[PDB]
């Protein structure tokens, strides 16, 4: 193994995570089906739970700008059967209605899993007008609590790519329309809260959005995927688990925005790989452990929250599944299960030294709301065990949950606490540990391709 | 959909399946880790008792040559975390050594689960007095109650192939090495229970076995791979769904070896494909329709049980896990789970017709014991969905739980009766569905690979 030093400081004050960090994102079309984001989808409802006791829940997509609210429509029989996987961006999506139906329907399940909303609102293709209606439908079933924001458009700087508006589309033309749907939706619903601009920290459309809207939105929505532009070499598991430029850069982006305008940010779409992801990469072990890294990299930084893209059977999806055959946790979701087991509280300073050969190693550490130490720990070298000398912390008892499967490529076998997460996301660790060392010295030994939490008395 | 009439004959007896008909074999070098096979492995417990309230461990394969059990030893550090996976076949397996608290911790691990025991003993490469002395022990802490056959060897009619014994060994000289093992065995232990000669039926080697040792064994032990010799076009699923006359012909076999000599035959060692399975078939869902349909098919035919051979996490495993990192499902496990659902009972008349366009959709009725009609169907058709029209049954309702999973060929997403098993073989329904229809005409629909069983009140 590569011994390393992990010195944590109690002094050293980061940010604070808060309870509704947590979250997933799924395709506006989804909607279409009533029976999905329902009070009878328990099941469902139970793996968000289990991601947490608050969190987000994102609707919106490429879908958003094809799905299209009608007040008097009724569900067809196909549309009781539709499950929406993430959007493949080869093309135009099938045209969706949204019912009444599926709004009251969304409330039932908002009510059991305890999450909040994002509702994207159709500003690519619809009318202000109707976007007004649905917005003030949503307003009247869901209420304000429970409603966070709405978005006008999916990634916006996108719509030229992509067949929505023509190649001359700019911010400029955007924050026009912006404008007449914010203008419209205000005056059905007066309380209306809005985020935005939807789409990855650039200069051309975040930036100047944040400046001309900073009065009208409550935050910034930004978006992320580890998988850069279609020129770049393919998303491989080991490029997945390196450090990010682009990433470090697009969040510093955003915290400048927060200094400029006082506007916080949230991620509000991101998964490991793009058009829906990319198998032996995006549904492997790996993304449970770039997840995991990813929840507390973002929190560290600042951010408000998270909500990881998924749906249907996706090669990317937290949870798969449908009404009808049931629902189960991919690997990516253990990577979230351990964010959610660790709590919220404040993060501390946490240095690693002697790990040149180990450099793929990282730890967070957190002062929880209960008062107790926790450290998350991802060895995300692919080829290296390491041993870890904690120092820092006094406690008569450390207890370790390993994040696991045998292979970093694995599709299936992935463990939490020594046990899989079972129907409805129910979840108890079956293998707990006690980390050898006393207060002031503890040592802990992971593999090569795992994680660890830490929780200290 | 492809519309089928299914012909159910209350009045066709077939066999009777008995209570501990279902099992699971795995390798002997597994015995070497005393944590393995252990009562406080109640994760692994708790999916056998799954699979069946009574069925059948057997312990055996390739590392039976390479096991050696000494009454003095102790298991070293190394062995405490030993997961041993089915044996590729490649070379020669790593030397092992077995212990009295492995026997002692085997038999506690008996007791948690109900099932019973065939036992492997070194005849490739031990003494007959080791083996004496190892079933001594095993008689002494099992007991005769649950344990139900020893075998001195795994696939004799192998050695040669894999280095054991010369080219010339032949069906006379392991007969004369099973002699010298078996009477000094009995010495030792005068009540001791043999299978014979674990190995796929052939005419060198199984039926001069029967004819020469019938008064000696109580059942015939039989092997096989649906994969044919490593000259044949490797598998596929689409092969797997398949008949195999192959199967049809080795059951023939052992069905007149049964009418010659008396003897009933256990199949205690199969799977998809050899050598530790094949990625890509061996790990999917369609495994789990083959191994479903499979236990039906053998049953048919009068067999007493079966053993789908595994451990570690290798391709085709039921099971995959350790006992530190814990323990799940794989696909193959809910072909297995639909059949434990089903129950015991009464086989019966169940014919197909209009069906020569959904070829490989199979059907199986029974009478189980607690006196109602259940049909399992496989409908192993990769491209055609089934409407099946079903006569001969009278009943006020009938209830359908579906074994799905969104493609043949996906390594997860596979649930029954719209559920996954979670922990320690936790399983319950959470999608039951009636079939349309009433007494005398009911009708069902399946998509192309899936499966389903049907309970009538
Ligand atoms: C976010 C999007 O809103 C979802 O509908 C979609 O399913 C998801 C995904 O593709 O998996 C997300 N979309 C993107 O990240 C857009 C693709 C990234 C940029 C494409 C390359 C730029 N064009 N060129 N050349
Ligand atoms: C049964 C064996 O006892 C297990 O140890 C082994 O893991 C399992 C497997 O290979 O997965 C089973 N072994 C076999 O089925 C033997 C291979 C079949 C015949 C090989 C080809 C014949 N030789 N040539 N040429």
Redo the contacts between chains.
Sequence with gaps: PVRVGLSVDASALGHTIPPDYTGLSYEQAQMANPNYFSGANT?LAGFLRTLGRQGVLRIGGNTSEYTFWNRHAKPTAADEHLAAGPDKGHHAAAREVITPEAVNNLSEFLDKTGWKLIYGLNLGKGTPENAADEAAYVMETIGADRLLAFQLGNEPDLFYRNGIRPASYDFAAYAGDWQRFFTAIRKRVPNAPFAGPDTAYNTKWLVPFADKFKHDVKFISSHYYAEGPPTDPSMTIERLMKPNPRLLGETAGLKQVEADTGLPFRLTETNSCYQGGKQGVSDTFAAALWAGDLMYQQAAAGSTGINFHGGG?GWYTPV??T????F?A?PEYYGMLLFAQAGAGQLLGAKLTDNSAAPLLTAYALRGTDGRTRIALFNKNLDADVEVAISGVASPSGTVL?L?A?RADD???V?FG???????G???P??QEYVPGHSGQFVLHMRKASGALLEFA
Excluded: F, M, N
């Design positions: 099941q059977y798969a599944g009404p009808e055959d049931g189960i991919r390993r696991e045998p599709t299936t076998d463990t020594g046990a899989p997460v079972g129907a409805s129910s979840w108890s079956l293998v």
